[PDB]
């Protein structure tokens, strides 16, 4: 399952005649594109690797 | 009828309303719609609102539709349901608006709020303007404005033209037929009157006030010149001093320097200036030069 | 008949209805339908509703069908089943609507609700407009509007033109033939009358009120200029002051500066202005210049 | 005959019926059928219904068949088996419908239900319209509408034009020849009458009511201008005020500013307006300008 | 009337006001709008304010 979430503030005078506005005209743009399932679980670093990435000297 | 023709009541004023609309029913004299995309865009908007969704990719080439701007005046104390006249003016490459019909148009104010709804049949003269028309009772008021009329015991009459003498004269006229301290002049353009507390009481008071007659006092001497239309207008208080005037192709009828007799009243001024035998185009330059020299004892305004 | 011709009743108003339709039966003077896709799209919609599904990929090139906009007025206290007149205006590249027939058209309000259904035969004059016609009793009311008429003991008469003197005069006229406190003016445009509680009682009261005659009081001095049609109209209360007028190709009949005699009534004004020998196109500029100078003691409006 | 000519009965109304059909028997003046696929599609549908299945892939190029829209009015209290007149209008690129015959056509209502079946011979005038005709008794009613007539003790007479005075006058007329409390006006457009319980009793009551004569009261002053046909109509209650009118190429017969005498009745108005020597096209602009100024004491409507 | 025609009162003066606008309803005698971009730009501004986004 993939979730695409959006939030922001849109000025009405930027909306085109087709009731559409580019995402770069939205002030507080919050764009999220996440997913779940084993496909997403395969793109998270292992806890030990994620610890060595932060605490290893080099 | 002098006070109403000379002054205006404070808070009793007209606003301006504007809106955009479409005029349909033209005999092939509408927009080309290939150079005015907003005409077809707004027609598609109207159809989509009415329940017809024309495909986005398509060519509409209309000939009986024109995009127009509608202007109107919001009258004082306007109440919803009343009707006002509107002026319809074409906006892009339309040949004529002869027998068109204005579709539903919301007339916005300065605050971008709808105060009237406009729809009707345009009347075009038929050297007459073809892209401009007028619709009598073409718009219906939909919103009302709150006002402070009827609140307080002061009402300001605002003179159309500023004059201390005229303000004092109106003050003395109101204070003769309406009590001792019924009016006080505040400046050259404002007369403050004391009104009874209430709403109908102030209406009655102002009805009395408005039809009173005031003796208009001499009002400045001025010569108005309109060079764009080539017209000159002089009021009664314009005088002249004796001085010599020379201009091209004008001569005493015998040199080119003609003496202009000092003049006290307006008839003397007209006779002296007609003695020069000057075309109004030449008369404008003569008047400007005399104002520079000092013969013309008046205020020269160029409008 | 003065009160009905001068005022309007609060809540007794006309709305505007709009709709889209097709006009059929034209003699080859309809849309090209290649530049107006909505005509063929809505014809296919009508056929699909009626039971004929034309293939999506096909070329229809009609000549007897035109897409039109229908406009009407929703009258006060309209009841379902009554008939109203409609105006039919072509919308795209149609030559004429001479003998067409308007198919079933739902007339929407501002709230996008159907208030009338329109269908009939168009009457086109036959220099006459060909893309605009009128159908008498062409639409039948299908929806009614709730109203507050008959509720409460106050009814507002709204003056067509704002005037404190006229409002006070109507107040005094209603309060002479209908009791002491039967009317109170609220502002320059509104007169509040006290009516008996009930529905038929208010109808009877307003029937009495409407046919009363009020003596119209002097009403402002104004000169209306319509430059688009080249017309000038002056009412009775327009006066003049003595001043000199000069304009191109106009001369005393002997200089170019003609004295305009002060004028008290309208006949004097007409005689003085005709003494100049000015075409109305020149007269408009003369009036504007005199208003600027101060000779013209009236309100100059450009419509 | 006044009450029937002024009002309508509640629930006694006419509906609109629409349908699609084919007209056959034309002398080569039908659709091209290459640009109007629905004509051939519906002809193939008719043949398939009748027992002839034309192959799907084939070229039919007809000349004596036209696809038409049929419109009719469903009359009040219509019973199945009765006949009504229909109007037949061509729908695509047909030259004429001179001597065609309308095939079986089901006339649907707004609810898309068949209320009549239409079939007959079209009568086309023969500057006459060729794609539009009328069939007298061309449709037979097949469905009836339930009604509430005869139920209850109230019947509403709906005035064609809203007027408090006329509503009160009808109320007083019904209450003079038909008992004390036989009618009560509800608003400016509705008069509620009390009828006996039953069906024939209400029929008798309304038969009595309908032929009563009411004295029509003065009804507003209005000037109707039809710019698309170039016509002006003024009713009896139109008056004028003394004011000056100027327009292009019009002069006193000697300046361009002509004084219009105040006028009380309609004959005075006609004489004063004819004194200007104005063409109706100029007269429309004159009337609009006078309405703006205030000379014209009437309601100017543009239709 | 001499003193009013010769002098002016201190503080009783006229100011100058300026603005930009559009004139509509001309009989084909307006701007070319291909050489005056501000005409079309301000017309689009007016339409966008009124609710039409070209």
PDB file of C-alpha atoms in Angstrom, chain B residues 53-267:
ATOM      1  CA  UNK B  53     -19.084  19.768 -20.312  1.00  0.00           C
ATOM      2  CA  UNK B  54     -17.421  20.546 -23.648  1.00  0.00           C
ATOM      3  CA  UNK B  55     -14.146  18.621 -24.181  1.00  0.00           C
ATOM      4  CA  UNK B  56     -11.030  20.521 -23.151  1.00  0.00           C
ATOM      5  CA  UNK B  57      -9.321  19.932 -26.480  1.00  0.00           C
ATOM      6  CA  UNK B  58     -11.650  21.427 -29.072  1.00  0.00           C
ATOM      7  CA  UNK B  59     -11.987  24.458 -31.334  1.00  0.00           C
ATOM      8  CA  UNK B  60     -14.960  26.755 -30.731  1.00  0.00           C
ATOM      9  CA  UNK B  61     -15.188  29.637 -33.205  1.00  0.00           C
ATOM     10  CA  UNK B  62     -18.212  31.693 -32.196  1.00  0.00           C
ATOM     11  CA  UNK B  63     -19.639  34.739 -33.942  1.00  0.00           C
ATOM     12  CA  UNK B  64     -22.737  35.711 -31.905  1.00  0.00           C
ATOM     13  CA  UNK B  65     -21.064  36.003 -28.476  1.00  0.00           C
ATOM     14  CA  UNK B  66     -19.112  38.949 -27.071  1.00  0.00           C
ATOM     15  CA  UNK B  67     -17.308  39.309 -23.747  1.00  0.00           C
ATOM     16  CA  UNK B  68     -18.337  42.580 -22.108  1.00  0.00           C
ATOM     17  CA  UNK B  69     -17.776  44.616 -18.960  1.00  0.00           C
ATOM     18  CA  UNK B  70     -20.857  45.939 -17.161  1.00  0.00           C
ATOM     19  CA  UNK B  71     -20.681  49.079 -15.020  1.00  0.00           C
ATOM     20  CA  UNK B  72     -23.359  50.524 -12.764  1.00  0.00           C
ATOM     21  CA  UNK B  73     -23.927  52.929  -9.890  1.00  0.00           C
ATOM     22  CA  UNK B  74     -25.095  51.682  -6.516  1.00  0.00           C
ATOM     23  CA  UNK B  75     -27.599  54.361  -5.448  1.00  0.00           C
ATOM     24  CA  UNK B  76     -27.940  55.762  -1.923  1.00  0.00           C
ATOM     25  CA  UNK B  77     -30.121  53.741   0.455  1.00  0.00           C
ATOM     26  CA  UNK B  78     -30.542  51.018  -2.148  1.00  0.00           C
ATOM     27  CA  UNK B  79     -32.700  48.113  -1.006  1.00  0.00           C
ATOM     28  CA  UNK B  80     -32.610  44.578  -2.349  1.00  0.00           C
ATOM     29  CA  UNK B  81     -35.109  43.970  -5.129  1.00  0.00           C
ATOM     30  CA  UNK B  82     -34.798  47.414  -6.713  1.00  0.00           C
ATOM     31  CA  UNK B  83     -33.505  47.891 -10.250  1.00  0.00           C
ATOM     32  CA  UNK B  84     -30.746  50.108 -11.654  1.00  0.00           C
ATOM     33  CA  UNK B  85     -29.411  50.955 -15.102  1.00  0.00           C
ATOM     34  CA  UNK B  86     -26.183  49.409 -16.381  1.00  0.00           C
ATOM     35  CA  UNK B  87     -23.697  50.255 -19.125  1.00  0.00           C
ATOM     36  CA  UNK B  88     -22.361  47.404 -21.260  1.00  0.00           C
ATOM     37  CA  UNK B  89     -19.020  47.863 -23.032  1.00  0.00           C
ATOM     38  CA  UNK B  90     -17.300  45.346 -25.285  1.00  0.00           C
ATOM     39  CA  UNK B  91     -13.846  44.137 -24.275  1.00  0.00           C
ATOM     40  CA  UNK B  92     -12.219  42.479 -27.284  1.00  0.00           C
ATOM     41  CA  UNK B  93     -12.427  42.742 -31.090  1.00  0.00           C
ATOM     42  CA  UNK B  94     -16.234  42.754 -31.301  1.00  0.00           C
ATOM     43  CA  UNK B  95     -17.792  44.597 -34.219  1.00  0.00           C
ATOM     44  CA  UNK B  96     -21.116  45.529 -32.615  1.00  0.00           C
ATOM     45  CA  UNK B  97     -23.562  44.845 -29.784  1.00  0.00           C
ATOM     46  CA  UNK B  98     -26.669  45.860 -31.724  1.00  0.00           C
ATOM     47  CA  UNK B  99     -29.346  43.461 -30.512  1.00  0.00           C
ATOM     48  CA  UNK B 100     -27.527  41.386 -27.939  1.00  0.00           C
ATOM     49  CA  UNK B 101     -28.783  40.137 -24.602  1.00  0.00           C
ATOM     50  CA  UNK B 102     -26.712  40.382 -21.433  1.00  0.00           C
ATOM     51  CA  UNK B 103     -26.600  37.075 -19.584  1.00  0.00           C
ATOM     52  CA  UNK B 104     -26.578  36.797 -15.794  1.00  0.00           C
ATOM     53  CA  UNK B 105     -23.764  39.045 -14.580  1.00  0.00           C
ATOM     54  CA  UNK B 106     -22.822  39.624 -10.916  1.00  0.00           C
ATOM     55  CA  UNK B 107     -21.839  43.246 -10.309  1.00  0.00           C
ATOM     56  CA  UNK B 108     -19.072  43.372  -7.708  1.00  0.00           C
ATOM     57  CA  UNK B 109     -18.072  46.298  -5.542  1.00  0.00           C
ATOM     58  CA  UNK B 110     -14.620  47.516  -4.630  1.00  0.00           C
ATOM     59  CA  UNK B 111     -14.649  44.911  -1.840  1.00  0.00           C
ATOM     60  CA  UNK B 112     -15.258  42.187  -4.476  1.00  0.00           C
ATOM     61  CA  UNK B 113     -18.737  41.414  -3.141  1.00  0.00           C
ATOM     62  CA  UNK B 114     -21.808  40.970  -5.324  1.00  0.00           C
ATOM     63  CA  UNK B 115     -24.197  43.894  -4.858  1.00  0.00           C
ATOM     64  CA  UNK B 116     -26.331  43.481  -7.985  1.00  0.00           C
ATOM     65  CA  UNK B 117     -27.218  40.926 -10.640  1.00  0.00           C
ATOM     66  CA  UNK B 118     -27.435  42.147 -14.233  1.00  0.00           C
ATOM     67  CA  UNK B 119     -29.327  40.644 -17.175  1.00  0.00           C
ATOM     68  CA  UNK B 120     -31.325  42.285 -19.934  1.00  0.00           C
ATOM     69  CA  UNK B 121     -31.515  43.531 -23.502  1.00  0.00           C
ATOM     70  CA  UNK B 122     -28.990  46.119 -24.669  1.00  0.00           C
ATOM     71  CA  UNK B 123     -30.133  49.297 -26.419  1.00  0.00           C
ATOM     72  CA  UNK B 124     -27.580  50.550 -28.957  1.00  0.00           C
ATOM     73  CA  UNK B 125     -28.303  53.851 -30.705  1.00  0.00           C
ATOM     74  CA  UNK B 126     -28.102  52.953 -34.382  1.00  0.00           C
ATOM     75  CA  UNK B 127     -21.622  57.878 -36.055  1.00  0.00           C
ATOM     76  CA  UNK B 128     -23.244  55.974 -33.194  1.00  0.00           C
ATOM     77  CA  UNK B 129     -21.248  53.731 -30.888  1.00  0.00           C
ATOM     78  CA  UNK B 130     -21.788  50.032 -31.611  1.00  0.00           C
ATOM     79  CA  UNK B 131     -19.744  48.370 -28.846  1.00  0.00           C
ATOM     80  CA  UNK B 132     -21.395  50.324 -26.038  1.00  0.00           C
ATOM     81  CA  UNK B 133     -24.980  50.133 -24.839  1.00  0.00           C
ATOM     82  CA  UNK B 134     -27.219  50.783 -21.866  1.00  0.00           C
ATOM     83  CA  UNK B 135     -29.800  48.587 -20.142  1.00  0.00           C
ATOM     84  CA  UNK B 136     -32.458  50.449 -18.171  1.00  0.00           C
ATOM     85  CA  UNK B 137     -33.450  48.534 -15.025  1.00  0.00           C
ATOM     86  CA  UNK B 138     -31.003  45.880 -16.192  1.00  0.00           C
ATOM     87  CA  UNK B 139     -29.635  45.034 -12.746  1.00  0.00           C
ATOM     88  CA  UNK B 140     -31.356  44.115  -9.485  1.00  0.00           C
ATOM     89  CA  UNK B 141     -29.834  45.047  -6.135  1.00  0.00           C
ATOM     90  CA  UNK B 142     -28.991  41.985  -4.045  1.00  0.00           C
ATOM     91  CA  UNK B 143     -27.086  43.502  -1.099  1.00  0.00           C
ATOM     92  CA  UNK B 144     -27.700  46.506   1.141  1.00  0.00           C
ATOM     93  CA  UNK B 145     -25.208  48.808   2.846  1.00  0.00           C
ATOM     94  CA  UNK B 146     -25.542  49.705   6.537  1.00  0.00           C
ATOM     95  CA  UNK B 147     -25.571  53.432   7.199  1.00  0.00           C
ATOM     96  CA  UNK B 148     -25.445  55.844  10.122  1.00  0.00           C
ATOM     97  CA  UNK B 149     -28.293  58.008   8.820  1.00  0.00           C
ATOM     98  CA  UNK B 150     -30.734  58.685  11.637  1.00  0.00           C
ATOM     99  CA  UNK B 151     -28.039  58.330  14.313  1.00  0.00           C
ATOM    100  CA  UNK B 152     -26.684  61.437  16.014  1.00  0.00           C
ATOM    101  CA  UNK B 153     -27.798  65.060  15.943  1.00  0.00           C
ATOM    102  CA  UNK B 154     -25.418  66.395  13.268  1.00  0.00           C
ATOM    103  CA  UNK B 155     -25.739  66.278   9.482  1.00  0.00           C
ATOM    104  CA  UNK B 156     -23.146  67.712   7.103  1.00  0.00           C
ATOM    105  CA  UNK B 157     -24.131  69.455   3.890  1.00  0.00           C
ATOM    106  CA  UNK B 158     -21.140  69.324   1.550  1.00  0.00           C
ATOM    107  CA  UNK B 159     -20.971  72.133  -0.993  1.00  0.00           C
ATOM    108  CA  UNK B 160     -20.248  71.027  -4.547  1.00  0.00           C
ATOM    109  CA  UNK B 161     -17.855  73.964  -5.043  1.00  0.00           C
ATOM    110  CA  UNK B 162     -15.826  75.337  -2.149  1.00  0.00           C
ATOM    111  CA  UNK B 163     -16.694  78.899  -1.150  1.00  0.00           C
ATOM    112  CA  UNK B 164     -16.577  80.638   2.226  1.00  0.00           C
ATOM    113  CA  UNK B 165     -19.221  83.138   1.121  1.00  0.00           C
ATOM    114  CA  UNK B 166     -21.554  80.392  -0.117  1.00  0.00           C
ATOM    115  CA  UNK B 167     -21.006  78.297   3.011  1.00  0.00           C
ATOM    116  CA  UNK B 168     -21.806  81.307   5.195  1.00  0.00           C
ATOM    117  CA  UNK B 169     -24.843  82.115   3.049  1.00  0.00           C
ATOM    118  CA  UNK B 170     -26.248  78.595   3.388  1.00  0.00           C
ATOM    119  CA  UNK B 171     -25.541  78.746   7.128  1.00  0.00           C
ATOM    120  CA  UNK B 172     -27.471  82.015   7.419  1.00  0.00           C
ATOM    121  CA  UNK B 173     -30.320  80.689   5.266  1.00  0.00           C
ATOM    122  CA  UNK B 174     -30.763  77.516   7.318  1.00  0.00           C
ATOM    123  CA  UNK B 175     -30.535  79.619  10.489  1.00  0.00           C
ATOM    124  CA  UNK B 176     -33.282  81.970   9.281  1.00  0.00           C
ATOM    125  CA  UNK B 177     -36.083  79.512   8.454  1.00  0.00           C
ATOM    126  CA  UNK B 178     -35.119  76.782  10.941  1.00  0.00           C
ATOM    127  CA  UNK B 179     -34.127  78.393  14.239  1.00  0.00           C
ATOM    128  CA  UNK B 180     -31.196  80.311  15.662  1.00  0.00           C
ATOM    129  CA  UNK B 181     -28.482  77.669  15.945  1.00  0.00           C
ATOM    130  CA  UNK B 182     -29.643  75.145  13.364  1.00  0.00           C
ATOM    131  CA  UNK B 183     -26.521  75.351  11.184  1.00  0.00           C
ATOM    132  CA  UNK B 184     -22.818  76.060  11.621  1.00  0.00           C
ATOM    133  CA  UNK B 185     -20.253  76.227   8.831  1.00  0.00           C
ATOM    134  CA  UNK B 186     -17.137  74.148   9.493  1.00  0.00           C
ATOM    135  CA  UNK B 187     -15.018  75.057   6.462  1.00  0.00           C
ATOM    136  CA  UNK B 188     -15.358  76.421   2.930  1.00  0.00           C
ATOM    137  CA  UNK B 189     -17.169  73.253   1.832  1.00  0.00           C
ATOM    138  CA  UNK B 190     -19.092  71.915   4.855  1.00  0.00           C
ATOM    139  CA  UNK B 191     -22.128  73.188   6.768  1.00  0.00           C
ATOM    140  CA  UNK B 192     -23.016  71.235   9.907  1.00  0.00           C
ATOM    141  CA  UNK B 193     -26.712  71.293  10.813  1.00  0.00           C
ATOM    142  CA  UNK B 194     -28.283  70.169  14.075  1.00  0.00           C
ATOM    143  CA  UNK B 195     -31.046  67.617  13.499  1.00  0.00           C
ATOM    144  CA  UNK B 196     -33.490  65.983  15.939  1.00  0.00           C
ATOM    145  CA  UNK B 197     -32.644  62.536  17.233  1.00  0.00           C
ATOM    146  CA  UNK B 198     -34.443  59.873  15.226  1.00  0.00           C
ATOM    147  CA  UNK B 199     -34.787  58.610  11.656  1.00  0.00           C
ATOM    148  CA  UNK B 200     -38.001  60.116  10.281  1.00  0.00           C
ATOM    149  CA  UNK B 201     -37.271  63.392  12.084  1.00  0.00           C
ATOM    150  CA  UNK B 202     -34.014  63.829  10.176  1.00  0.00           C
ATOM    151  CA  UNK B 203     -35.789  62.900   6.927  1.00  0.00           C
ATOM    152  CA  UNK B 204     -38.381  65.622   7.550  1.00  0.00           C
ATOM    153  CA  UNK B 205     -35.689  68.135   8.516  1.00  0.00           C
ATOM    154  CA  UNK B 206     -33.651  67.459   5.377  1.00  0.00           C
ATOM    155  CA  UNK B 207     -36.780  67.592   3.210  1.00  0.00           C
ATOM    156  CA  UNK B 208     -37.398  71.085   4.574  1.00  0.00           C
ATOM    157  CA  UNK B 209     -33.738  72.072   4.108  1.00  0.00           C
ATOM    158  CA  UNK B 210     -33.279  70.778   0.564  1.00  0.00           C
ATOM    159  CA  UNK B 211     -35.866  72.932  -1.229  1.00  0.00           C
ATOM    160  CA  UNK B 212     -34.796  76.205   0.399  1.00  0.00           C
ATOM    161  CA  UNK B 213     -33.483  78.884  -1.950  1.00  0.00           C
ATOM    162  CA  UNK B 214     -30.221  80.731  -1.273  1.00  0.00           C
ATOM    163  CA  UNK B 215     -29.108  83.847  -3.220  1.00  0.00           C
ATOM    164  CA  UNK B 216     -25.931  82.715  -5.068  1.00  0.00           C
ATOM    165  CA  UNK B 217     -23.093  85.228  -4.470  1.00  0.00           C
ATOM    166  CA  UNK B 218     -20.544  86.280  -7.175  1.00  0.00           C
ATOM    167  CA  UNK B 219     -18.301  83.211  -7.676  1.00  0.00           C
ATOM    168  CA  UNK B 220     -14.732  83.937  -8.917  1.00  0.00           C
ATOM    169  CA  UNK B 221     -13.778  84.992 -12.387  1.00  0.00           C
ATOM    170  CA  UNK B 222     -12.546  82.194 -14.611  1.00  0.00           C
ATOM    171  CA  UNK B 223     -12.030  81.463 -18.296  1.00  0.00           C
ATOM    172  CA  UNK B 224     -12.278  77.771 -19.176  1.00  0.00           C
ATOM    173  CA  UNK B 225     -10.405  76.717 -22.319  1.00  0.00           C
ATOM    174  CA  UNK B 226     -10.865  73.230 -23.766  1.00  0.00           C
ATOM    175  CA  UNK B 227      -8.157  72.878 -26.402  1.00  0.00           C
ATOM    176  CA  UNK B 228      -9.138  69.298 -27.232  1.00  0.00           C
ATOM    177  CA  UNK B 229     -12.608  70.469 -28.291  1.00  0.00           C
ATOM    178  CA  UNK B 230     -11.619  74.049 -29.122  1.00  0.00           C
ATOM    179  CA  UNK B 231     -14.052  75.860 -26.831  1.00  0.00           C
ATOM    180  CA  UNK B 232     -13.801  78.905 -24.571  1.00  0.00           C
ATOM    181  CA  UNK B 233     -16.279  79.787 -21.815  1.00  0.00           C
ATOM    182  CA  UNK B 234     -16.117  82.923 -19.663  1.00  0.00           C
ATOM    183  CA  UNK B 235     -18.386  83.552 -16.695  1.00  0.00           C
ATOM    184  CA  UNK B 236     -19.853  86.913 -15.706  1.00  0.00           C
ATOM    185  CA  UNK B 237     -17.114  88.028 -13.325  1.00  0.00           C
ATOM    186  CA  UNK B 238     -14.358  88.155 -16.082  1.00  0.00           C
ATOM    187  CA  UNK B 239     -12.922  91.697 -16.731  1.00  0.00           C
ATOM    188  CA  UNK B 240     -10.183  93.154 -18.928  1.00  0.00           C
ATOM    189  CA  UNK B 241      -7.563  95.878 -18.753  1.00  0.00           C
ATOM    190  CA  UNK B 242      -6.593  98.143 -21.629  1.00  0.00           C
ATOM    191  CA  UNK B 243      -3.706  96.559 -23.521  1.00  0.00           C
ATOM    192  CA  UNK B 244      -2.499  95.876 -27.047  1.00  0.00           C
ATOM    193  CA  UNK B 245      -2.806  92.484 -28.752  1.00  0.00           C
ATOM    194  CA  UNK B 246      -0.926  91.308 -31.843  1.00  0.00           C
ATOM    195  CA  UNK B 247      -1.269  87.933 -33.532  1.00  0.00           C
ATOM    196  CA  UNK B 248      -0.609  86.391 -36.913  1.00  0.00           C
ATOM    197  CA  UNK B 249      -2.902  87.386 -39.793  1.00  0.00           C
ATOM    198  CA  UNK B 250      -4.940  89.676 -37.506  1.00  0.00           C
ATOM    199  CA  UNK B 251      -4.958  93.427 -38.087  1.00  0.00           C
ATOM    200  CA  UNK B 252      -6.932  96.538 -37.205  1.00  0.00           C
ATOM    201  CA  UNK B 253      -9.880  96.940 -39.566  1.00  0.00           C
ATOM    202  CA  UNK B 254      -4.767  99.519 -39.701  1.00  0.00           C
ATOM    203  CA  UNK B 255      -1.715  97.866 -38.196  1.00  0.00           C
ATOM    204  CA  UNK B 256      -1.308  94.453 -36.620  1.00  0.00           C
ATOM    205  CA  UNK B 257      -1.381  95.766 -33.029  1.00  0.00           C
ATOM    206  CA  UNK B 258      -4.993  96.190 -31.886  1.00  0.00           C
ATOM    207  CA  UNK B 259      -5.882  98.022 -28.686  1.00  0.00           C
ATOM    208  CA  UNK B 260      -8.351  96.102 -26.407  1.00  0.00           C
ATOM    209  CA  UNK B 261     -10.508  98.532 -24.373  1.00  0.00           C
ATOM    210  CA  UNK B 262     -10.600  98.067 -20.594  1.00  0.00           C
ATOM    211  CA  UNK B 263     -13.810  96.222 -19.777  1.00  0.00           C
ATOM    212  CA  UNK B 264     -15.899  96.064 -16.601  1.00  0.00           C
ATOM    213  CA  UNK B 265     -18.765  93.648 -17.309  1.00  0.00           C
ATOM    214  CA  UNK B 266     -18.997  90.560 -19.488  1.00  0.00           C
ATOM    215  CA  UNK B 267     -20.726  92.283 -22.415  1.00  0.00           C
TER     216      UNK B 267
END
